């Protein structure tokens, strides 16, 4: 088995504090060679994610624009947000609209400042953000809002995810899957639901929908360098 990996630079904050601006990440593709009986031939597989990686996939609306997410929906789950305590609830094997009571386990522990405050410019009266700061706990910043943190269980596999607690998604807007009341999802075969783990500051599948198997790219593996300036302290592995 042969595989091929592509290193990528992260510009935005959408999976912070897992992946921050700055972070250069080095990406398992999916698709790998293997040596058919031996040898020859040259063969070629490809793997799929597993709940809760962090991958790289096409841009589904505009397949030109590689985004960096993490795969909280496999075919089949049923995955439903609940904007108000921004937790999600996902029922692997629940998509013939059945009334289903498994469930995969998913944990949240207690919310707790996080290191990071996010700033608006005050562009004639309203906000526009202007960016995200690491500010000492005990100090604040002016048109700034902490943002809070707490660690998710999906299954087995725990992460981080940032909430901006002055905040809460317009469920009006987001992506509405026929015959499923908003914020409710059933992922098709062959396709996943992406949710940045920067909540409140993420363009994922809640808003347009599914990412079919055909548009993913990798899995992101280490993150290999980051530069805010040389921030050696963040290589290794991601977590
Ligand atoms: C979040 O920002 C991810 C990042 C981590 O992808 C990178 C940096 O490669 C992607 N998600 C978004 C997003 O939700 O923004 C949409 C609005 C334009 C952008 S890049």
Excluded at 66 to 81: E, F
Excluded at 139 to 167: C, M, Y
Excluded at 190 to 201: A, I, P, V
Aim: charged share 20%; net charge negative; hydrophobic share 35%.
């Amino acid at each position: 088995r042969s595989f091929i990996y592509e290193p990528f630079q992260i510009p935005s904050g959408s999976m912070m504090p897992t992946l921050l601006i700055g972070d250069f990440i080095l990406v398992e593709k999916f698709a790998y060679g293997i040596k058919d009986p031996i040898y020859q031939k040259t063969l070629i597989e490809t793997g799929h994610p597993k709940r809760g990686d962090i991958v790289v996939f096409k841009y589904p609306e505009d397949p030109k624009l590689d985004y960096i997410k993490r795969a909280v929906g496999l075919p089949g789950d049923k995955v439903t947000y609940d904007p108000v305590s921004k937790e999600l609830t996902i029922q692997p094997g629940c998509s013939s609209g059945q009334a289903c009571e498994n469930a995969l386990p998913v944990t949240y522990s207690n919310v707790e400042p996080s290191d990071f405050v996010q700033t608006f410019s005050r562009r004639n009266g309203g906000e526009a953000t202007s960016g995200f700061f690491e500010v000492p706990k005990n100090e604040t910043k002016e048109n700034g809002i902490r943002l809070s943190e707490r660690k998710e269980t999906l299954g087995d596999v725990t992460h981080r995810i940032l909430t901006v607690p002055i905040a809460q998604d317009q469920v009006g807007m987001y992506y509405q899957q026929p015959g499923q009341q908003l914020a409710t999802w059933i992922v098709p075969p062959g396709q996943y639901f992406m949710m940045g783990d920067n909540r409140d500051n993420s363009a994922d599948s809640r808003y347009w929908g599914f990412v079919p198997e055909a548009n993913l790219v990798g899995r992101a593996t280490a993150i290999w360098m980051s530069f805010d300036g040389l921030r050696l302290s963040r290589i290794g592995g991601i977590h």
